[PDB]
Design a protein around this ligand. Structure first.
Ligand SMILES: Cc1cc2nc3c(=O)[nH]c(=O)nc-3n(C[C@H](O)[C@H](O)[C@H](O)COP(=O)(O)OP(=O)(O)OC[C@H]3O[C@@H](n4cnc5c(N)ncnc54)[C@H](O)[C@@H]3O)c2cc1C
Ligand SMILES: Cc1cc2nc3c(=O)[nH]c(=O)nc-3n(C[C@H](O)[C@H](O)[C@H](O)COP(=O)(O)OP(=O)(O)OC[C@H]3O[C@@H](n4cnc5c(N)ncnc54)[C@H](O)[C@@H]3O)c2cc1C
Lengths: 437, 437
């Protein structure tokens, strides 16, 4: 009618993509934007967003490389295997990782045209409630109109501005997976699942890794398991600086001089910041429409309907506040919105009992409620916990037939196990059913 | 005062163990026998039964050894890991395996007395409805009386008697996990999940294996997958002799000349039989009490309640007919019987939806009815199938909301995936649930 496109998505990640290929799968004409702003270290990559280029894919691949070395050094010789001169080539791992990422970048290209979604390689910005201005990447504007707009820009790794040298001298998850030079003696700053996973496979590869955590590691997860992971990581050679953080970074002849709140200065080889990520919003001119944005984390504020502060606009994925930063949790929410918008669907997003799996030296799969968080919502009185690397932790409700609220496992292949249990939780499994299984 | 014991258990395997302890855990005077008759190659072992000494445990340890290699060969180098002079010491592996097996041997021993279950290391024989005779291990016979008697003697590998030289020249699973000398060029006769697993890890270790099958592999599971597993094993270097079996085995300078039905005669270093296992009942004197036994496999015929024709005697584990040969399936079955007997329990053993995992080169975990099993039971119009190393087979009912009845996954970690999804099936999952997951 009087709109260039019915569906104008901003961001080519799993979410934005997942929704586009869905809106076009129901007739609607969809225009999709995706442009990778270079990292703080000038690193760039192809179409696919975070998960593919600097997330799940490269992360898991790296992990595997680290797990091999771990298997060789711990078990290999005990199981009758004999080998000589065991060494690891960093550049070989990267070339393999980056090679695979590129074969996906192309695999996703030939995917858009197949779904017939007009893809433009340019960074977009909000011109008007129904209009989207953009720059094709030289900068000359080009405007477009759409019946509905989706914001799926996700987030980008956060680096502190108050810390002198941090921004310029350190790297992030954005750079590590395509890093040319050897990581060398590495300092990892943060306690996220990313921070521990990175310092996790770096240590397994045989690097001098050191993690600086302000307070706790894996905040948001069950802390009885979090502590077991940290202890294990410490036994494997990962050293933690508890309560100490970098105050300033200085260059010293191809080495980084890090000064901690400790007043202690230990010069490292590579500094990696993984203190969290904040939504990529600053370039979307949102103040011009007074959108509901969370200042703390820079995310769009979205109701479960996925509707924004403005009726015309929507938000899905890592940009939405309180929405778990997972590839799958982002794909579905995008699928549903497409049906809500173009198939007159009545289904709404389900954010409960989604399983996450941290790929640390010792894996930690989690689905449902933490123990402590289950106490806040239901109280110790009404919450019962059971144990049942063969450790498993089941958190269930006292008052309603010990129905399982949460499930946590710190063991080999936790990712695999937790995924199955996740479906059992949705079917409202109960301890009764477990012991009798 | 009537009998010497309240409970007399013949068999020290998983089933016998689990039961005796559960019986003693509720106030019953329990006597338990266990005596490992030497293999056809004179191989003997400590207390714990099959799973521990010549089953699950060792099998899994061996597989893991082979798996390492497979990682070295296939993936190691691609991930930046370099090394020299890769070799495998068979002896080192057995000493590691056997060491662990012995650590368990002692664990269980100290466990029984810890649960106060009078244990005799003698092989038993039925004297009458509630009297058991046994011989210490010259001979003397000691009788003992019991209110309830349980037989849990499991099975032992089968070697054909019609084939000349087989019994004397060839080996079985009883032998391999403690084999002094190298297996060398190995011929594995049979297609059982044991048959494939063994030839699998032997192959992964780097031996010249050869599997002679009658017709099909893994009869009883979903053939669609059984074909995948065979194909993959072939690509990995396993040679299958289809529809060709040995008709005679001859000795020759430390090698064995195997003459096949093919009219072809080739020579191997080691010939392993895994064509199936038959219940160890022959020496129980059961035919004295006209027991109901399945003639083809020498198994006791069991009640849903684990009852024989003789109400004073019960049967559990692997000796019972149509009872799946899994360590867990024998424990739960042996623990219910105990409660049933000594704690007036009204509970019955459920056999449906029990998960198995085949540790072949490519793992294949299964749970629920097979595709052919489903059809014959429910009908093709009634049943629909859905397919997801990333592919899973779902066999669900058309008529009742596509409730899953069979889950088959051939992948990296089938065991884990199958285990989890197993519980889901018991909760009566639907394809509708899976799609939503
Ligand atoms: C190291 C790491 C490991 C992870 N591992 C896992 C895992 O194992 N499993 C899991 O489920 N999740 C994992 N995640 C999280 C997962 O990657 C994200 O939650 C998922 O990618 C969400 O995608 P999204 O569409 O919401 O945002 P994104 O995937 O980040 O997509 C946003 C895209 O839009 C583009 N863009 C941004 N701004 C603009 C603009 N204004 N104009 C045009 N284009 C723009 C960006 O280039 C970006 O590529 C991991 C994350 C990280 C960092
Ligand atoms: C190679 C192999 C691999 C396997 N892997 C797995 C697996 O991975 N997972 C799984 O769940 N299951 C596995 N199984 C099956 C599992 O081992 C059995 O199903 C389980 O051990 C059942 O034990 P049971 O107590 O019923 O009998 P058994 O374990 O065989 O116990 C019977 C015991 O009684 C003793 N006995 C026999 N006669 C007498 C006598 N008259 N007097 C005194 N004692 C006697 C025998 O010496 C024997 O030790 C495997 C089996 C094999 C052969």
């Amino acid at each position: 009618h009087t709109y260039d496109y019915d569906y104008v998505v901003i961001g080519g990640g799993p979410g934005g993509m997942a929704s586009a290929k869905e809106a076009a799968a129901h007739g609607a004409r969809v225009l999709l934007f995706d442009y990778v702003k270079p990292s703080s270290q000038g690193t760039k990559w192809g179409i696919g967003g975070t998960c593919v280029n600097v997330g799940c894919v490269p992360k898991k691949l790296m992990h595997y490389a680290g797990h091999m070395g771990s298997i060789f050094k711990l078990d290999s010789k005990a199981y009758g295997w004999k080998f000589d001169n065991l060494k690891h080539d960093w550049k070989k791992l990267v070339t393999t990782v980056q090679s695979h990422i590129r074969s996906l970048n192309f695999s996703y290209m030939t995917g858009l045209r197949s779904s017939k979604v007009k893809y433009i390689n340019g960074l977009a910005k909000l011109k008007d409630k129904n209009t989207v201005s953009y720059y094709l990447k030289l900068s000359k504007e080009e405007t477009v109109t759409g019946k509905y707009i989706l914001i799926a820009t996700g987030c980008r790794p956060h680096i502190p501005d108050d810390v002198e040298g941090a921004k310029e001298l350190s790297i992030t998850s954005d750079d590590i997976f395509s890093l040319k030079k050897d990581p060398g003696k590495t300092l990892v700053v943060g306690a996220s699942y990313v921070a521990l996973e990175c310092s996790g496979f770096l240590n397994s590869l045989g690097y001098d890794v050191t993690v600086a955590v302000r307070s706790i590691v894996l905040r948001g997860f069950d802390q009885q398991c979090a502590v077991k992971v940290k202890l294990y990581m410490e036994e494997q050679g990962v050293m933690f600086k508890n309560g100490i953080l970098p105050k300033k970074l200085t260059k010293m002849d191809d080495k980084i001089l890090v000064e901690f709140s400790d007043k202690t200065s230990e010069l490292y080889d590579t500094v990696l910041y993984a203190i969290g990520r904040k939504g990529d919003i600053d370039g979307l001119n949102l103040e011009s429409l007074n959108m509901n944005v969370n200042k703390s984390n820079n995310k769009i504020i979205a109701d479960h309907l996925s509707c924004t502060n403005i009726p015309s606009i929507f938000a899905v994925g890592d940009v939405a506040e309180n929405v778990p930063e997972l590839a799958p949790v982002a794909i579905k929410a995008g699928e549903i919105l497409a049906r809500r918008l173009f198939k007159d669907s009545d289904e709404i997003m389900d954010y409960s009992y989604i399983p996450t799996s941290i790929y640390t030296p010792i894996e930690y799969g989690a689905c449902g409620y933490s123990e402590e968080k289950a106490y806040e919502l239901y109280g110790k009185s009404n919450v019962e916990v059971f144990l049942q690397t063969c450790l498993a932790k089941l958190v269930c409700l006292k008052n309603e037939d010990n129905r399982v609220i949460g499930f946590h496992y710190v063991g080999p292949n936790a990712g695999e196990v937790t995924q199955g249990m996740a479906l059992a939780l949705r079917l409202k499994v109960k301890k009764k059913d477990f012991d009798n299984c």
